[PDB]
A paper describes a structure:
GTA catalyzes the transfer of GalNAc from UDP-GalNAc to the H antigen acceptor (HAA) (α-l-Fuc-(1→2)-β-d-Gal-O-R, where R is glycolipid or glycoprotein) to form the A antigen, whereas GTB catalyzes the transfer of Gal from UDP-Gal to the HAA to form the B antigen. Among these is the enzyme AAGlyB, a dual-specificity GT, which can bind and utilize either UDP-Gal or UDP-GalNAc with equal efficiency. Each letter corresponds to one critical residue in increasing order such that the AAGlyB chimer would correspond to GTA-L266G/G268A.
In the AAGlyB-2 and AAGlyB-2-HAA complexes where the 5-substituent of the donor analogue is a phenyl group, the electron density is well defined throughout most of the only chain in the AAGlyB-2 structure and chain A and B in the AAGlyB-2-HAA structure. In the AAGlyB-2-HAA structure, upon binding of the acceptor, the internal loop also goes from a disordered state in the “donor-only” complex to an ordered closed conformation with Trp-181 stacking to the phenyl substituent of 2. However, compared with the AAGlyB-1-HAA complex the internal loop of the B chain of AAGlyB-2-HAA is slightly less ordered, and residues 196–198 are missing entirely. Furthermore, in the AAGlyB-2-HAA structure the C terminus of both chain A and B in the asymmetric unit does not fold over the binding site in the same way as seen in chain A of the AAGlyB-1-HAA complex and is only visible until residue 346. Also, the lack of electron density of the C terminus cannot be explained by poor data resolution because AAGlyB-2-HAA diffracted to 1.7 Å whereas AAGlyB-1-HAA diffracted to only 1.9 Å. Our results suggest that this pseudo-closed conformation allows the transfer of the sugar, albeit at a slower rate than the native, closed conformation, and could therefore be the reason for the small, residual turnover observed for AAGlyB toward 1.
Author numbering:
A (entry chain B): 58 to 195, 199 to 346
B (entry chain A): 58 to 346
Write the structure that this text describes.
Amino acid sequence: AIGEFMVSLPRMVYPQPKVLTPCRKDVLVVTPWLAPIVWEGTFNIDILNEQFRLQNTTIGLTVFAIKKYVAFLKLFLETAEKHFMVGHRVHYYVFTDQPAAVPRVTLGTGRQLSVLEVRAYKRWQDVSMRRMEMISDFRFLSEVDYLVCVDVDMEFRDHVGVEILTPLFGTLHPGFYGSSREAFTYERRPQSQAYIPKDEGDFYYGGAFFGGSVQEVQRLTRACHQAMMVDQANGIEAVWHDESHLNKYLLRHKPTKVLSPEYLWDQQLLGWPAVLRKLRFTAVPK
Amino acid sequence: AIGEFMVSLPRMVYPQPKVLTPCRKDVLVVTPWLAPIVWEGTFNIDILNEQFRLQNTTIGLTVFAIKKYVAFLKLFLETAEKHFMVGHRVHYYVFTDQPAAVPRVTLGTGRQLSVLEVRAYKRWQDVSMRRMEMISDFCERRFLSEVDYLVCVDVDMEFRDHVGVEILTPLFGTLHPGFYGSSREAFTYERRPQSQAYIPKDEGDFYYGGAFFGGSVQEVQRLTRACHQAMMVDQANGIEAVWHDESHLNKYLLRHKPTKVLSPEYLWDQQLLGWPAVLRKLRFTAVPK
Ligand SMILES: O=c1[nH]c(=O)n([C@@H]2O[C@H](COP(=O)(O)OP(=O)(O)O)[C@@H](O)[C@H]2O)cc1-c1ccccc1
Ligand SMILES: O=c1[nH]c(=O)n([C@@H]2O[C@H](COP(=O)(O)OP(=O)(O)O)[C@@H](O)[C@H]2O)cc1-c1ccccc1
Ligand SMILES: CCCCCCCCO[C@@H]1O[C@H](CO)[C@H](O)[C@H](O)[C@H]1O[C@@H]1O[C@@H](C)[C@@H](O)[C@@H](O)[C@@H]1O
Ligand SMILES: CCCCCCCCO[C@@H]1O[C@H](CO)[C@H](O)[C@H](O)[C@H]1O[C@@H]1O[C@@H](C)[C@@H](O)[C@@H](O)[C@@H]1O
Ligand SMILES: [Mn+2]
Ligand SMILES: [Mn+2]
């Protein structure tokens, strides 16, 4: 459940946080609306695990594996088992047009998988974009506390845990975390619902990893889908599809945490910069 | 109200946050449980003002002015009018044994004051400690219906710069000005295991000041009730914590991590501690007494 109040922790022994000696001096670790930006070295996972275990938190993870992308499921699920929310209750929701093609993956205790059969759109943009509709229409409200929504063409390489959980989060796109807002590939046509002008924008968030409480994720995905439908009626398709709309949404509804690109990376394209102490969730070659 | 969901903001023009060039590199700006530590430069007050105005946020500010401490009210209130939550709904709650002694102070629109008549304890320790009981009692009697957040402070203070909605969150504490740079073994926690407020030398995140804490009404109700109950247990065991209510506040916040922590910009004594470079603003400061 998501607790209504602060929980009470047991005695714990860990290093004292030092007010005058911050660990991360190389990156921004809080947004101007006072949401934390999650990097290695900013959190004590022992404290956070206690907080979330005491609420018996259940996390849902949605992933789409339509047409040839079913091939990515084996590695995605096997690595999630090693690295995603270990110790907490996890419900995987695998959306696919080929239920029989879902690999049998052995799950740890307290983890479950549901296979949701869905339509395969012809245009890859429509598959990517129509995730918003499918997530928004999809039982989660009675089953999980948080939803995490990710691409399938990925693997976990390192810890991704309850440090990310919060009412609404987006993830810094790995291609643009160091870029100025004028360079962001936001939709720039005022005719699109995803329009963001050159003098606005905080971050460029990646469409491949967002989430929050079930209620907030439902609102986000419903709003993105609606905006896409308006665009479609107006004869326009945003430059980066679902991601463009995600960015418009998070511009106007500020996320309560932002994840660093540790959580969404492509080592082939981008290497392993000093600023990334861990590479947690990374692109698989395709 | 406290809105159930994220609010939708209008178009705003402001400097872009830069991921690779943080403004504050000199201080910790987030706790290990991912609560912001609020320092000048960490927040854009225009964004926060929008978020909180859109929810028509009402902030209650409690202050005790028992016996001779009514003398502090005029400066406290006049300065609060200049600096505290300006632009938002505010409700001051003055707990006093002398209602007729509360100074007439002209208030801005959307701001009001209630005088709460309470008993005066003989021992200064009890006056300080019984604030927890009194706040908790009034949470049920008044605060839950009247305000969204409560901010609970000492009266022997004045506002000297902005104190606003950047502090609002479910539960917050404030880094005590005497110890923000100290190691946990130098914190003056209650060190006697017999006390409910006991914290051993190998525990503790911060030393929080008893003079400035707050949160949602429901969290403040829980904190103040818990602290009073701990103090009653101590009393029945014939023990009184070294720093009274502050000792219990520290025990409470160790075990119930605050969702924001305020830097000592929000609780300072300039005569005693000067003005270190790390403090770019002095917002709420001790009055000589
Ligand atoms: O045929 C698909 N089936 C499918 O299930 N997807 C889902 O959409 C996500 C986004 O598409 P990606 O190819 O991973 O997009 P990028 O990461 O921007 O390259 C995939 O991870 C996957 O979960 C995506 C595709 C697809 C196939 C070809 C081109 C674009 C998208
Ligand atoms: O006579 C009092 N009346 C009163 O209302 N108070 C309230 O308790 C608060 C804390 O006591 P302080 O004297 O400010 O304590 P310190 O900040 O530790 O000096 C005061 O701000 C005030 O709000 C405190 C006192 C008091 C009087 C003498 C000694 C200690 C406390
Ligand atoms: C420094 C600026 C110039 C260099 C920018 C380098 C990263 C570009 O990234 C693409 O960015 C697009 C938006 O502009 C979309 O999000 C696209 O899905 C993404 O590529 C996806 O994610 C990438 C990380 C790769 O995994 C790529 O194969 C994917 O197709
Ligand atoms: C570096 C360590 C050694 C030096 C520590 C210097 C500050 C000490 O501070 C006192 O600390 C106590 C707890 O240990 C209580 O909170 C007390 O109320 C407080 O004094 C109150 O607040 C102070 C800021 C002053 O305003 C003082 O006049 C007050 O009585
Ligand atoms: Mn992808
Ligand atoms: Mn005082």
